[PDB]
Design a protein around this motif. Structure first.
Motif, mmCIF file in Angstrom:
data_model
loop_
_atom_site.group_PDB
_atom_site.id
_atom_site.type_symbol
_atom_site.label_atom_id
_atom_site.label_comp_id
_atom_site.label_asym_id
_atom_site.label_seq_id
_atom_site.Cartn_x
_atom_site.Cartn_y
_atom_site.Cartn_z
ATOM 1 N N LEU A 1 -2.935 -0.810 8.364
ATOM 2 C CA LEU A 1 -2.387 -2.066 7.870
ATOM 3 C C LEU A 1 -1.236 -2.577 8.749
ATOM 4 O O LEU A 1 -1.142 -3.777 9.039
ATOM 5 N N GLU B 1 0.828 -1.211 0.000
ATOM 6 C CA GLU B 1 0.000 0.000 0.000
ATOM 7 C C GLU B 1 0.863 1.262 0.000
ATOM 8 O O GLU B 1 0.424 2.356 -0.410
ATOM 9 N N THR C 1 -4.602 4.758 6.349
ATOM 10 C CA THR C 1 -4.678 3.405 5.794
ATOM 11 C C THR C 1 -3.385 2.614 6.074
ATOM 12 O O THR C 1 -3.416 1.513 6.652
ATOM 13 N N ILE C 2 -2.250 3.192 5.702
ATOM 14 C CA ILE C 2 -0.953 2.535 5.901
ATOM 15 C C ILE C 2 -0.677 2.242 7.386
ATOM 16 O O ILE C 2 -0.183 1.158 7.732
ATOM 17 N N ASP D 1 -1.586 2.442 -5.025
ATOM 18 C CA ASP D 1 -2.884 2.791 -4.413
ATOM 19 C C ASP D 1 -3.882 1.641 -4.614
ATOM 20 O O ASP D 1 -4.359 1.415 -5.734
ATOM 21 N N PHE D 2 -4.202 0.921 -3.545
ATOM 22 C CA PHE D 2 -5.222 -0.132 -3.600
ATOM 23 C C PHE D 2 -6.628 0.460 -3.525
ATOM 24 O O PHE D 2 -6.859 1.408 -2.762
ATOM 25 N N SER D 3 -7.574 -0.099 -4.285
ATOM 26 C CA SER D 3 -8.991 0.200 -4.053
ATOM 27 C C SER D 3 -9.367 -0.512 -2.764
ATOM 28 O O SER D 3 -8.602 -1.369 -2.282
ATOM 29 N N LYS D 4 -10.535 -0.203 -2.206
ATOM 30 C CA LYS D 4 -11.015 -1.002 -1.079
ATOM 31 C C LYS D 4 -11.224 -2.461 -1.521
ATOM 32 O O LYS D 4 -11.385 -2.729 -2.712
ATOM 33 N N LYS E 1 -8.936 2.613 4.640
ATOM 34 C CA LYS E 1 -9.304 1.210 4.602
ATOM 35 C C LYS E 1 -9.811 0.816 5.978
ATOM 36 O O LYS E 1 -9.495 1.488 6.964
ATOM 37 N N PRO E 2 -10.615 -0.254 6.053
ATOM 38 C CA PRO E 2 -11.232 -0.620 7.334
ATOM 39 C C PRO E 2 -10.248 -1.039 8.421
ATOM 40 O O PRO E 2 -9.312 -1.811 8.141
#
Ligand SMILES: O=S1(=O)NCN(C2CC2)c2ccc(O)cc21
Ligand SMILES: O=S1(=O)NCN(C2CC2)c2ccc(O)cc21
Ligand SMILES: C=C(C)[C@H]1CN[C@H](C(=O)O)[C@H]1CC(=O)O
Ligand SMILES: C=C(C)[C@H]1CN[C@H](C(=O)O)[C@H]1CC(=O)O
Ligand SMILES: [Cl-]
Lengths: 250, 251
Positions: free
Chosen positions: B229, A93, B225-226, A97-100, B97-98
């Motif tokens: 993760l 990541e 997000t990073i 850029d990852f999508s969800k 991201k979740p």
């Protein structure tokens, strides 16, 4: 402009269509990811050319920190999207850029039925049953980078004797599990697919390190957020569930 | 210093217990405060926690309210809360991201033959519903799936009497009456480990997750997000959940 989609052969995400005659272009392929791509292009209105990643790899760093696989293709702008069971991870990541996620999975254990092994911890506290993972895949990296006691012990075993407990690909791991006393640390989605087709095999224990597969785009891609939004639409409509059921059921 | 919008919701964000009046961030504790703390460590930002002034998560009437609106208006930099990642929301904010994954399930009293959503759908004796204007309600509202369409038809009827205003109302209603609550599975797990009269019925439908909200174009979204993760791969998110979910313990 027609978008370049990098992908990789992997059942049942991307497979060669079997035909009496030679096939050309996108018609060469079928699989979950081909159906996904079609649902994506219908919503967003892009044309695409599916192309196998030339080095046949997902994306990992060597000693020099250099990237390979679909990840490298995206970094170097040789593809617009990567559509594959490409696991969302910290190291990836940071460079693309990852999508969800369009599919959720976890690390679990593929093993034969009728054994008393019930968890990762059962494997960790013994030496008779061999276990490992696909070399350089995100599962292996998880164990390599973990500081959790049980997983460090498992990584020590896995990396012992020049990584002989590791396999080059999933298909090799599956044969090893079927033939010898070996448990494969594998992503839960792939375990489901395999156990639907190998009735002597089963998942052992639950999921660890839950994550997902996402569409990969180069950093800064205008397509990333749009594909994320399309994914959420497909998910809320129940189509992603239906798409998995189609390819997974045996 | 970043302004973080949030909302009181057990055990994500709660008023901390003290004999003295509390001020600032020290007012709060919970899974989301622990997460905020971890994100701030990795990223190196200071943060100011502020309860969303209208006490709402974020729904559209076509204008937005709640934590989503705060982000849109740039009155907060981050939303840290059990804010469900959804199609309508993702179009107006940039979700990280979740950090937690979940689904819709059923909260119900014990002792019944009810085993699934389909069971509820084919009858009208057991009332069922959801938090009004919540993402769960909206799932059923927008679904074209026959079984969910039918459930939505029941929930929305009689001026939406089967719906509740908040999860706490839903729980009491489940405890008192022949009522089942359509609830996010993480919340079900939390309550059913504290009240042993309650249970989850059937599995999860509509896998989804909670994400940190940021306004569209935010430079923090990807950084967060990073950070998420890393926390997941280190096993910290998993530890954080176990910490706040353990409760009193139910069989
Ligand atoms: O890699 S992720 O986007 N963030 C980390 N998490 C887990 C919940 C923390 C998950 C979980 C499921 C999924 O499909 C994707 C992710
Ligand atoms: O909202 S999401 O990022 N994309 C949709 N999906 C499901 C797999 C299709 C999930 C699943 C789990 C999760 O924690 C978050 C998401
Ligand atoms: C099949 C392979 C090598 C891939 C697929 N997802 C992971 C990845 O994207 O790294 C790998 C599986 C694993 O590492 O268990
Ligand atoms: C607790 C509340 C009102 C929130 C939590 N996540 C959902 C949301 O972010 O809309 C709502 C729950 C639900 O709709 O079941
Ligand atoms: Cl994202």
């Amino acid at each position: 402009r027609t978008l370049i989609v990098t992908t990789i052969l992997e059942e049942p995400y991307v497979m060669y269509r079997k035909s009496d005659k030679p096939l050309y272009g996108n018609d060469r392929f079928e699989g979950y990811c081909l159906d996904l791509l079609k649902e994506l292009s219908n919503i967003l209105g892009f044309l695409y050319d599916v192309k196998l990643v030339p080095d046949g790899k997902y994306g990992a760093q060597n000693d020099k920190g250099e990237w390979n696989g679909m990840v490298k293709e995206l970094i170097d702008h040789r593809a617009d999207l990567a559509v594959a069971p490409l696991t969302i991870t910290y190291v990836r990541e940071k460079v693309i850029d990852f999508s969800k996620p369009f599919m959720t999975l976890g690390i679990s254990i593929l093993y034969r039925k009728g054994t008393p092994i019930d968890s990762a911890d059962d494997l960790a506290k013994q030496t008779k049953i061999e276990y490992g993972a696909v070399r350089d895949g995100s599962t292996m990296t998880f164990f390599k980078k973990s500081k959790i006691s049980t997983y460090e012990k498992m990584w020590a075993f896995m990396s012992s004797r020049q990584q002989s407990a590791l396999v080059k690909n999933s298909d090799e791991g599956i044969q090893r599990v079927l033939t010898t006393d070996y448990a494969l640390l594998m992503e839960s989605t792939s375990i489901e697919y395999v156990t639907q087709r190998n009735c002597n095999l089963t998942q052992i224990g639950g999921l660890i390190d839950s994550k997902g597969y996402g569409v990969g785009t180069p950093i800064g891609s205008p397509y990333r957020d749009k594909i994320t939004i399309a994914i959420l639409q497909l998910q809320e409509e129940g189509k992603l569930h239906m798409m998995k059921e189609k390819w997974w059921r045996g």
